[PDB]
């Protein structure tokens, strides 16, 4: 699927 790259994890 489409995506927008990494995000802040936790």
């Amino acid at each position, epitope marked *: *699927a*489409v*995506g*927008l*790259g*990494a*995000v*802040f*994890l*936790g």
Partner: antibody
Amino acid sequence: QEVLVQSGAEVKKPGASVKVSCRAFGYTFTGNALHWVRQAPGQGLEWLGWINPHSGDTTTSQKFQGRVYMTRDKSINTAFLDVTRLTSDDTGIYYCARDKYYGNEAVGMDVWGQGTSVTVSS
Amino acid sequence: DIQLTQSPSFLSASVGDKVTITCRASQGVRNELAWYQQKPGKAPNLLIYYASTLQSGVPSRFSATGSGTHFTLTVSSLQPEDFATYFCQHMSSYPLTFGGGTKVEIKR
């Protein structure tokens, strides 16, 4: 716990712009991509685009490129939708919606704001 | 753009009935499809993702199947809270698009 709170109803003239805001509560704002989706009166759902609140990266539907701008302010956990050059075709209810965003891809819109009514009329 | 065609557009049923809604994609989208419920004056609520996994807190009388182009959503026993409009949505490529919706009304 996850909640999206949108700004209030807007009434604009043709050719004007509108800025709707969407503040995330109950989860880490920078952890999930956020969509913008609108619904004209009695019509279906139309996708405008989505934003990565961590990086500010966006993808905007070709129909709305040049007219729709998605930004965010991390300090207030708020994402913004700018819609310029409005016409009566833009009248409707505008939603922000969080994506589950498993594995950094689109999966499903699991949290929806309450919607912002935008009326474009003379 | 991938167009999603839902059938039927309108459905009449009774409490307790089993109903199946269909979503056909004009192109293959693998498992990258979600289902939503919407009631008048309310935002949609996510029911299904990955074409067949139930969203947390969704009742188990909802289930869904499908891969590629043909997808179905099933309510095993319609309850009063289930009368509403249902949408499919794909996310395999841009732009993300929704189906036209299937409205489920009360039979009388």
